[PDB]
Amino acid sequence: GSHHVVPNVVQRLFQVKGRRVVRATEVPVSWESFKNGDCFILDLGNNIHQWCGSNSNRYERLKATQVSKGIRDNERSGRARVHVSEEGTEPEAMLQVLGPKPALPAGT
Ligand SMILES: [Ca+2]
Ligand SMILES: [Cl-]
């Protein structure tokens, strides 16, 4: 019809962590939640950002892919796009959501 005036889903962040047992758990959407030893999945609805820290292990990296693709396929009927980045290669879209990055420790 001519006017759509009655309303009406939110950003989420998942931590992917473990070795023997790799677990995905929801955490606050914030840079403060990120850790260099794990992988994180930032669900923005139409885009999913998959980020692995420099010290993440292979099982976390594999599980992170499974989680990203699971949201894409099971929740977004395959239409959301997945972007893999890592520590230091984050795309501008992540910074728009999460704001300025945590500074690196002096002397890198
Ligand atoms: Ca880890
Ligand atoms: Cl991308």
Author numbering: 148 to 155, 158 to 257
Could you share sentences copied from the article?
Gelsolin is a 80 kDa protein displaying six homologous, gelsolin-like, domains (named G1 to G6) existing as two alternative splicing variants: a 24-residue shorter intracellular form and a variant secreted in the bloodstream. Both isoforms bind actin fibrils, severing the filaments and preventing repolymerization.
In the wt structure, the C-terminal tail is wrapped around the globular domain and is involved in extensive interactions with loops β2-β3 and β1-β2. More importantly, it provides a sort of lid for the calcium binding site, contributing to the hexacoordination of the ion with the side-chain of D259.
